[PDB]
C-alpha cells in the first residue's frame, strides 16, 4: 500500500495513507500504521567482526569487507549461499545473484516457501495474485484456503468486505474458523475436502460451476506446511476443472495466490530458489544473511566453523549468530523496488539516510564485489535498474498489473507429480488479533506494538 | 460595502479602459492585450519587438507624454515557455497617471534596450542583467551591478537556491578570503504554509 | 533574422550550477497527494518539481539539523506535466515522471442505507 | 565507535569528523597550520594555552560554533594535562621552544613535558598519540636541543607504545625561523640542508591521523631537495632583490642535515613535497622593496 | 528536583545527561552547565485539587485575559480527577 | 523551421570566430594579471586554467548558448583589466582550500552515503 | 560452459513476438519434460524486442534477439543453446 513518510529534521515523524484507488484505496493497516517506531530500536549503525573471545566487536567498513572477501576468495562453488529476508528490495537481490553468480552458486534461498514441483516459478503467473486487488470487486463467488487475509493481508481483506457489503459476494473458506468480519461458508477444515471439489461431490463445486467470475486464493502459509505441492496442485486442479466446465468466460484469471512477505515476488521474478530446501540438502561453509530473521537455519544444521555474514538494519534473531555484520538500510533510507502480491512493482523514496554507518544494501554487495576481484558492472542506481530490466523487465515498469495469463501451462506441469496430501486440518499462523502484531524485526523491535498485544492480551 | 471594504472608483476606471482604447487604436502593429484591474491600474501585453516602438509613443504623444520612469523590474515564471516577464511602470505628470507595460522573453532571446527612450532604465536593465539573465541589446555597458564578482548564477530566477552554492570565509593557510560549498549548521526548514478549501472563487479555473 | 536552427534546448552552461548538482541530482515530478488529514483537494491542483533528498545530520552545538546539499528546499510549480518535463529537460536533470491519480467517481445513494434486502443497511446512523 | 564520534557530513566547516584532537602548543607556528587543517573538516580541537587569550584571537575562526575550545594548563602539573586530554581520542603535542627560559630549559620541554603528556594519554585511554621531535635528533650530537629529543623520543615511545613520532626536517613556511632569520641578516660552503615546507608537515600529521596502520610507525618528513647552505642562501637574498640564536641555533644550523633511507616519509602518506622553488617567493615577498640554486642528488 | 547523574552532571528537567563516553562533556570543563532547578512537574505535584460542586468546571489559568484561553472540564469520572490542558490544576466533584 | 533570433551571431562559425578573439584576449591578458595581482601561480599555471575553462564549454552545439558564453567571459574580462576583483575572486578559480573529492566507487562508499 | 537457466523476454502485444507467443502455447510444457531442472524463465516485455538470455557458469550471459522468429526458428535457437552447439 502507498504511503506518506513525515519527517522533520532528517527524522520519520509518522505514517500517513496515500490514495492509490486500485491497492488500498485510502486505508493502511495499523502495523503499516505504527512499526515505524521499531525503526529507532535495536538498531545495526556500525560494521561488526568477532575477536579473540568470540564477542561482536565494532569495525570499519575496511576489515569487515575484506574479511568477508577473503573466504568469499577462500570457497567457492556450492559452499558458499544466501538466504533473503522479508524486507529485503529488488536491487540487493540482483546484486546478490550476481555477486554469488561470480562464484558459480545457485543457492538463493528464500525464508518462504513456494512449490518448485513442475512450472515452480518459470512462470510468473504460478505465483501471483491475478485477478488483482482491485478485480475483487467483479468477482461474485471467491474461495480461500489455509488463509486469515485479515492479518496476512488487511488490506485485500478490507476489499473483500467491501465487496461483500456492495456486490453481495459469496466467500468460502477452507480452514480454521477465523473470524472475517463478514459472515462466510465454512466448508470444512481438512486438505481434502478440497480434492472432494475436485472430485465433484461437495456441492460448493456446483457452486463456483455456476458463477460467473469465480475466485480461488491461495496463501503462502498454507504453502508453508509442506503439502504445498499437492495442495497447489489441488487449487489448480479446481480451477481447471472450473474453466473447463464452465467454459472460458474471457481473460478471468481464476487462480490467484496471496503473498505474505514483501520481498518474495521480487525474489522469485529474480530466480531465487524459494525455500531453504536446497540449504539443507548441501550445507553450506559460509552463508550470506541478507536480511534475514526468521531462524529456519540456525548453526544446528550447519557445519562447524561456518561464515555467517548478516548484512540488515535491525539486530533480531539472525545478527548474534553472524561472524560479520554489515549494517544496512531500512525501507524509508533507500530507493528500492518492491513488487506486491499482485505483481505490480513500485518504488520507495529516500525519506532519511540510514543511521551512524549503515549503507544502501546493494552499494554494500557491490562494494563487497569490488573487493574481492568480482566487480560488479553497476556503479549507479540506474545502472543496477538495467541490471534488473535485464534480467527481469516488469521490474522497471512501476505501475503495471497486467500481465500474461499461462495457466494451461502451469496447471499440465502440475499432474507429473502426485504427491499425497496430509491428514492435518490447515490451520493459518494468524490465529488471532495478538498474532498479527508482531511479524518482523520491525514490529519486533517496535514499542507500540508491544503495547497493542500487551492490550489485546488483557485490556483496561 | 461597510467601512472595512476599499471603496471603488467607476470613473478613473472609465477614463482608464478609455485611454486603453485609444492606445490599442494607435498601435496594433504591437499590443497584444490591454486590462484594467478593480483597483485601477491598467497595464498593456505587448509584443517584445514593440517595446521600443510603444515606449517611445507613450512618452512624447501629446495623450500620453508618460515622461518618468518609476521602475523596471522582471518576473521568472518558469511554466511559460517565455520565462520571463519584462514590466514597465510609467509615470505621466501632465495627466497624473500611471501605466504599466508589460512584455516576454526567454534565456535565449535578447530584448532591445530602452537606454535611449528613458535614461533611467541604463541600470534598473543592468540590474534585470545581474538578476535574472535577460539580455539587453545596445545596452551602453551591460554588467553585473550588485552580485560579487565572479558569482556564477542568476539568483532571482525561481530554481535559484535560497543560499545559493558557495560561501565565503578567511583561510590562514592561504591567508586570504576563500569561497566553499555551502554548509548549514541548521538547514532552513521549508513550511508547507498553503492550505486545501481554496479561498477566493472568483479565480478558480476550468477543471480541463 | 532568424536562425531557424535545430537541436534541443540545454542552458546547463549559463545556469552557473555546479556540474555534480546536474549529474547526480535526480528530479520527481508529481502531484502531490492530498493530505489524509483533511479533505480539501485544493492543494493536488498543479504539478510540483522537487528532487531527491541528501543526507542530514546533527549538529554536534545545540543537536539543530544541518545539511550539506543547496536544493535541499527547492520546489517549482507547473500547471500541466509538459512543462515541468520541458524545464527538467533543458536544465539537465534526469527525472522521473509520475502520472496524476484522481479518485474514480462513486455512486453515493442515500436511500441505499434503508435497503430491503441487500447489505448496505446500516445499522445506526 | 560511540555514536557521538562517527562521521557526518561532506567534510566541510560544519560536518563532524569523529576526531577529538588536542593539540598542545597549538599557539606555535605549526599549531596554526594544524589546527586550521583540523577545523576547516568539521573535527574538534581543544587547545591549551599558558599565554594571554589575546595571543590565540588569530585561531577562533579556523573551526565553527562551539567547535575549538580554549584551556589554560601548565606542563609542571599534571591534573591541569588530565583534564585537558580527558575527553580527547587524538593527542598532538607541538611544544617545543628553540632557547632556553629562567623556568624552562630543553631538558623541561623536550622531555619532562612530552613524557608527563604520553602518561596522561595513556591513563585517560587516547587511542592515538602524535609526537614531534627533529630529524637530526640523536643522544650523542654535541647539541643539547638534539640531545634532549633523543632523550625525550625515547621516553615517550615508553610511556606510549604505540605512538607516532613525527621527525620533520627544517621547517620552512611564511612565519618560520629558516627563511625569515637568513632573511633579517641584511660560514657555508660545507652544510647542505633539507627543507619542508609547513603545509606538508600540517598534511602529514593529519594523514598520520586519518592512517591506523601508522600507530608505533616513526616518519622522516623532508623536501624534494637537497642544498648547499652557501648557494641557498645565495638563492634567499636573491630572492629578497637583496645585495649579498645565541649559540646552539648556530651550530644547529651548521650542522648538516642527516639522511635516514630506512624511516618512511611523507610519500608513503600520499604527499608530494613541495619544492622550495615555488614558496620561496611566497614567503620572501615581503623582504624587497628566478636562477634557482643548484640542488644535490 | 534536580538529580545527579553518575558522571555527575545534573539532570535537566528533559531528562538530558551525556554519558560517561561522550567527548561533548569537554565543554563544561572549566565552566558550568546551565540547569533550571525548578521543575515545573514537583511544582505542579504540590499543588492541591480543588473540590468544585458541579458537573463542568471552568478554567482560564488566573488572570483574566493574563492567563490562558478558557476551557470546560467534565467531572463525571469518579476514579481520577479532571486536569487543565493548559494550567495543569486539577478539579475534582466532592465524593462522599 | 524552430527559427529563434540571434544574439550577435548567424550560426557557428562566427561564435567560433568570437570564442577565438576572446581567448586570444584571455591569453594576451593572463601575464599582466599575473604580475598585477602579485599572485603566486606560474603564467603558465594560469593560461592552463584559461584552457580549461574553455574547454569545459567544448561540448556547446548552439550559436545563441556560444556567444551568451562569449559576453560572460568578456565581462569576466573586463573585470579582472579594471582590477574590479581582487586577489581573493581571482584565486578561487584554483579551489586551494578544497579537499580533493575521490571519484572511485569503493572511496565514496566510505565516506558516506552521496554518489 | 555449463548452462544454469534460461530467461525468455516476450511481448504481450507486439507483433515481433507473435510467433514467439506460440512456442510457448504450443511446446513450453514438452521443453519443461525435457529438462526437470533447468529454470526456463519466462519474462514480459513492452516496444522491446523479444530476446533469449543464455546464463552459463561464472556468471557468463548471451543473448539474442528473437524479432519476428517463429515458432520453429525459436525451437531451433533453443536446442543450439541446450546442446552447446553453434
Ligand atoms: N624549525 C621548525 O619549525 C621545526 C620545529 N621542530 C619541532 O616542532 C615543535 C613545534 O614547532 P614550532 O611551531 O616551530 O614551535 P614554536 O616556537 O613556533 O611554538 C612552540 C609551541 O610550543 C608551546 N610551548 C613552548 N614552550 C612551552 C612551555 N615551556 N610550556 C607550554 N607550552 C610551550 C608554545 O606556546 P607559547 O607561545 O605560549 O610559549 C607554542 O604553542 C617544536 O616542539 C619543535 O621541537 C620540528 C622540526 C623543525
Ligand atoms: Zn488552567
Redesign the interface.
Same mark, same amino acid.
Given at each position: 500500500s502507498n504511503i506518506v513518510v513525515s519527517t522533520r529534521t532528517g527524522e520519520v515523524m509518522r505514517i500517513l495513507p496515500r490514495m492509490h484507488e486500485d491497492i488500498n484505496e485510502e486505508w493502511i493497516s495499523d502495523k503499516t500504521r505504527f512499526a515505524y517506531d521499531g525503526l529507532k530500536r535495536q538498531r545495526l549503525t556500525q560494521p561488526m567482526i568477532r575477536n579473540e573471545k568470540g564477542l561482536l566487536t565494532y569495525t570499519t567498513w575496511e576489515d569487515a569487507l575484506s574479511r568477508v572477501a577473503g573466504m568469499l576468495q577462500s570457497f567457492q562453488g556450492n559452499d558458499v549461499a544466501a538466504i533473503a529476508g522479508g524486507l529485503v528490495d529488488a536491487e540487493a537481490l540482483v546484486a546478490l545473484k550476481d555477486l554469488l553468480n561470480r562464484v558459480d552458486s545457485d543457492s538463493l534461498c528464500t525464508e518462504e516457501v513456494f512449490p518448485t514441483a513442475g512450472a515452480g516459478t518459470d512462470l510468473r503467473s504460478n505465483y501471483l495474485l491475478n485477478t488483482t486487488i482491485a478485480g475483487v470487486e467483479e468477482a461474485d463467488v471467491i474461495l480461500l484456503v489455509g488463509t486469515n487475509p485479515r492479518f496476512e493481508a488487511p488490506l485485500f481483506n478490507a476489499r473483500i468486505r467491501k465487496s461483500w457489503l456492495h456486490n453481495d459476494l459469496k466467500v468460502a473458506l477452507i480452514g480454521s474458523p477465523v473470524d472475517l468480519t463478514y459472515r462466510y461458508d465454512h466448508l470444512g477444515d481438512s486438505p481434502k475436502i478440497l480434492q472432494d471439489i475436485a472430485s465433484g461431490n461437495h456441492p460448493f463445486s456446483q457452486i463456483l460451476k455456476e458463477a460467473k467470475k469465480p475466485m480461488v486464493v491461495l496463501g503462502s502459509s498454507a504453502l508453508q506446511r509442506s503439502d504445498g505441492t499437492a495442495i497447489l496442485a489441488a487449487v489448480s486442479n479446481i480451477a481447471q476443472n472450473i474453466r473447463l466446465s464452465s467454459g472460458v468466460t474471457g481473460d478471468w484469471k481464476v487462480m490467484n495466490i496471496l503473498h505474505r512477505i514483501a520481498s518474495q515476488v521480487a525474489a522469485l521474478d529474480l530466480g531465487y530458489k524459494p525455500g531453504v530446501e536446497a540449504i539443507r540438502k548441501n550445507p553450506p561453509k559460509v552463508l550470506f544473511l541478507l536480511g534475514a530473521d526468521g531462524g529456519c537455519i540456525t548453526r544446528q544444521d550447519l557445519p562447524k566453523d561456518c561464515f555467517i555474514i548478516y548484512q540488515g538494519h535491525h539486530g533480531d534473531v539472525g545478527a548474534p549468530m553472524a561472524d560479520v555484520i554489515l549494517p544496512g538500510a531500512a525501507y524509508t533510507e533507500k530507493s528500492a523496488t518492491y513488487v506486491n502480491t499482485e505483481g505490480r512493482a513500485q518504488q520507495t523514496k529516500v525519506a532519511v539516510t540510514p543511521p551512524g554507518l549503515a549503507r544502501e544494501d546493494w552499494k554494500i554487495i557491490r562494494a563487497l564485489s569490488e573487493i574481492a576481484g568480482m566487480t560488479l558492472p553497476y556503479d549507479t542506481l540506474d545502472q543496477v535498474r538495467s541490471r534488473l530490466e535485464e534480467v527481469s523487465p516488469n521490474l522497471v515498469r512501476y505501475d503495471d498489473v497486467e500481465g500474461a495469463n499461462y495457466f494451461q501451462q502451469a496447471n499440465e506441469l502440475s499432474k507429473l507429480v502426485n504427491q499425497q496430501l496430509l491428514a492435518d486440518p490447515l490451520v493459518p499462523p494468524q490465529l488471532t488479533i495478538k498474532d498479527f502484531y508482531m511479524t518482523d524485526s520491525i514490529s519486533r523491535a517496535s514499542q507500540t506494538m508491544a503495547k497493542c498485544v500487551k492490550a489485546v492480551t488483557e485490556g483496561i | 460595502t461597510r467601512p472595512t471594504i476599499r471603496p471603488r472608483n467607476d470613473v478613473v476606471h472609465k477614463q482608464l479602459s478609455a485611454f486603453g482604447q485609444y492606445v490599442a487604436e494607435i498601435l496594433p502593429k504591437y499590443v497584444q492585450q490591454v486590462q484594467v484591474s478593480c483597483f485601477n491600474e491598467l497595464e498593456i501585453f505587448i509584443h517584445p519587438d514593440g517595446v521600443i516602438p510603444v515606449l517611445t509613443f507613450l512618452r512624447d504623444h501629446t495623450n500620453a507624454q508618460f515622461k518618468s520612469l518609476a521602475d523596471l523590474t522582471a518576473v521568472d515564471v518558469? +511554466? #511559460? !515557455?517565455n520565462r520571463f516577464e519584462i514590466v514597465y511602470n510609467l509615470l505621466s505628470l501632465r495627466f497624473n497617471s500611471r501605466i504599466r507595460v508589460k512584455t516576454y522573453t526567454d534565456? *535565449? +532571446?535578447?530584448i532591445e534596450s530602452s537606454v535611449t527612450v528613458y535614461k533611467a532604465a541604463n541600470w534598473y536593465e543592468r540590474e534585470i542583467w545581474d538578476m535574472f539573465?535577460v539580455?539587453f541589446?545596445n545596452h551602453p555597458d551591460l #554588467?553585473?551591478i550588485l552580485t @560579487? &564578482?565572479?558569482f556564477?548564477?542568476?539568483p532571482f530566477? $525561481? @530554481?535559484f537556491? *535560497? %543560499?545559493? &552554492?558557495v560561501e565565503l570565509? &578567511? @583561510? @590562514?593557510?592561504? $591567508?586570504?578570503?576563500?569561497? =566553499?560549498?555551502? =554548509? *548549514?549548521? !541548521?538547514?532552513?526548514? $521549508?513550511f508547507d504554509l498553503? %492550505?486545501?478549501?481554496?479561498a477566493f472563487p472568483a479565480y478558480r !479555473?476550468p477543471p480541463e | 533574422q532568424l536562425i531557424a536552427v535545430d537541436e534541443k534546448l540545454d542552458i546547463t552552461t549559463l545556469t552557473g550550477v555546479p556540474e555534480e548538482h546536474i549529474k547526480t541530482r535526480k528530479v520527481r515530478i508529481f502531484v502531490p497527494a492530498r493530505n489524509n488529514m483533511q479533505s480539501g483537494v485544493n492543494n493536488t491542483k498543479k504539478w510540483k518539481m522537487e528532487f531527491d533528498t541528501r543526507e542530514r545530520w546533527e549538529n554536534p552545538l545545540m543537536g539543530w539539523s544541518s545539511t550539506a546539499d543547496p536544493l535541499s528546499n527547492l520546489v517549482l510549480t507547473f500547471s500541466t506535466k509538459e512543462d515541468a518535463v520541458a524545464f527538467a529537460e533543458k536544465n539537465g536533470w534526469s527525472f522521473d515522471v509520475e502520472e496524476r491519480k484522481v479518485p474514480k467517481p462513486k455512486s453515493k445513494s442515500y436511500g441505499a442505507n434503508f435497503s430491503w434486502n441487500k447489505r448496505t443497511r446500516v445499522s445506526t446512523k | 565507535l560511540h555514536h557521538a564520534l562517527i562521521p557526518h557530513g561532506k567534510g566541510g566547516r560544519s560536518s563532524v569528523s569523529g576526531i577529538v584532537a588536542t593539540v598542545f602548543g597549538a599557539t606555535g607556528f605549526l599549531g596554526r597550520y594544524v589546527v586550521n587543517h583540523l577545523g576547516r573538516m568539521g573535527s574538534q580541537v581543544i587547545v591549551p594555552y599558558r599565554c594571554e587569550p589575546y595571543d590565540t584571537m588569530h585561531l577562533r575562526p579556523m573551526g565553527d560554533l562551539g567547535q575549538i575550545i580554549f584551556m589554560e594548563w601548565n606542563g609542571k602539573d599534571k591534573d591541569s594535562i588530565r583534564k585537558v586530554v580527558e575527553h580527547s581520542n587524538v593527542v598532538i603535542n607541538l611544544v617545543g621552544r628553540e632557547w632556553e627560559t629562567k623556568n624552562f630549559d630543553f631538558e623541561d620541554v623536550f622531555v619532562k613535558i612530552p613524557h608527563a603528556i604520553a602518561q596522561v594519554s595513556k591513563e585517560a585511554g587516547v587511542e592515538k598519540l602524535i609526537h614531534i621531535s627533529h630529524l637530526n635528533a640523536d643522544i650523542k650530537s654535541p647539541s643539547r636541543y638534539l640531545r634532549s629529543k633523543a632523550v625525550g623520543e625515547k621516553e615517550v615511545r615508553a610511556a606510549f607504545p604505540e605512538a607516532t613520532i613525527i621527525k620533520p626536517s627544517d621547517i620552512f613556511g611564511r612565519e618560520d625561523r629558516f627563511l625569515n632569520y637568513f632573511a633579517s641578516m641584511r660560514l657555508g660552503k660545507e652544510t647542505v640542508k633539507q627543507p619542508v615546507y609547513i603545509v606538508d608537515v600540517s598534511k602529514g600529521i593529519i594523514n598520520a591521523i586519518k592512517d591506523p596502520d601508522a600507530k608505533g610507525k616513526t616518519f622522516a618528513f623532508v623536501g624534494p631537495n637537497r642544498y648547499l647552505l652557501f648557494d641557498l642562501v645565495q638563492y634567499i637574498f636573491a630572492v629578497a632583490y637583496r645585495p649579498f640564536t645565541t649559540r646552539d641555533k648556530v651550530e644547529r644550523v651548521h650542522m648538516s642535515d642527516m639522511t635516514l633511507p630506512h624511516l618512511p616519509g611523507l610519500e608513503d602518506l600520499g604527499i608530494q613535497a613541495t619544492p622550495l622553488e615555488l614558496k620561496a617567493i611566497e614567503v620572501l615577498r615581503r623582504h624587497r622593496t628566478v636562477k634557482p640554486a643548484k640542488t644535490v642528488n | 528536583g534536580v538529580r545527579t547523574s553518575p558522571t555527575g552532571e545534573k539532570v535537566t528537567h528533559t531528562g538530558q545527561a551525556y554519558d560517561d563516553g561522550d567527548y561533548r562533556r569537554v565543554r563544561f570543563s572549566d565552566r558550568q552547565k546551565e540547569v533550571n532547578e525548578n521543575f515545573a512537574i514537583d511544582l505542579i505535584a504540590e499543588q492541591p485539587v480543588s473540590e468544585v460542586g458541579s458537573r463542568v468546571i471552568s478554567c482560564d489559568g488566573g488572570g483574566g485575559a493574563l492567563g490562558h484561553p478558557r476551557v470546560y472540564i467534565n467531572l463525571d469520572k469518579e476514579t481520577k480527577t479532571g486536569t487543565c490542558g493548559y494550567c495543569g490544576l486539577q478539579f475534582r466533584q466532592p465524593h462522599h | 523551421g524552430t527559427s529563434v533570433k540571434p544574439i550577435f551571431s548567424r550560426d557557428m562559425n562566427e561564435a567560433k570566430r568570437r570564442v577565438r578573439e576572446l581567448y586570444r584576449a584571455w591569453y594576451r591578458e593572463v601575464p599582466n594579471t599575473v604580475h598585477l595581482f602579485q599572485l603566486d601561480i606560474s603564467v603558465k599555471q594560469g593560461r592552463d586554467k584559461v584552457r580549461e575553462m574553455f574547454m569545459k564549454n567544448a561540448h556547446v552545439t548552439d550559436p545563441r548558448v556560444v556567444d551568451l558564453l562569449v559576453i560572460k567571459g568578456k565581462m569576466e574580462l573586463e573585470e579582472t583589466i579594471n582590477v574590479w576583483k581582487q586577489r581573493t575572486h581571482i584565486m578561487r578559480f584554483f579551489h586551494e582550500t578544497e579537499a580533493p573529492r575521490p571519484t572511485d566507487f569503493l572511496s565514496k562508499f566510505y565516506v558516506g552515503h552521496d554518489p | 560452459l555449463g548452462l544454469r537457466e534460461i530467461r525468455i523476454h516476450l511481448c504481450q502485444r507486439s507483433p515481433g513476438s507473435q510467433g514467439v507467443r506460440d512456442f510457448i502455447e504450443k511446446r513450453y510444457v514438452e521443453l519443461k519434460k525435457a529438462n526437470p531442472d533447468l529454470p526456463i524463465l519466462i519474462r514480459e516485455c513492452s516496444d522491446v524486442q523479444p530476446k533469449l538470455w543464455a546464463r552459463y557458469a561464472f556468471g557468463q550471459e548471451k543473448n539474442v534477439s528473437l524479432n519476428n522468429f517463429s515458432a520453429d526458428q525459436v525451437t531451433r535457437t533453443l536446442e543450439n543453446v541446450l546442446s552447446g552447439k553453434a
Open positions: - | 518558469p +511554466t #511559460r !515557455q534565456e *535565449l +532571446t535578447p539573465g539580455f541589446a #554588467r553585473r @560579487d &564578482y565572479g556564477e548564477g542568476h530566477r $525561481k @530554481d537556491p *535560497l %543560499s545559493g &552554492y570565509r &578567511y @583561510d @590562514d593557510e592561504v $591567508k586570504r578570503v576563500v569561497a =566553499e560549498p555551502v =554548509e *548549514l549548521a !541548521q538547514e532552513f526548514r $521549508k498553503n %492550505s486545501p478549501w481554496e !479555473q | - | - | - | - | -
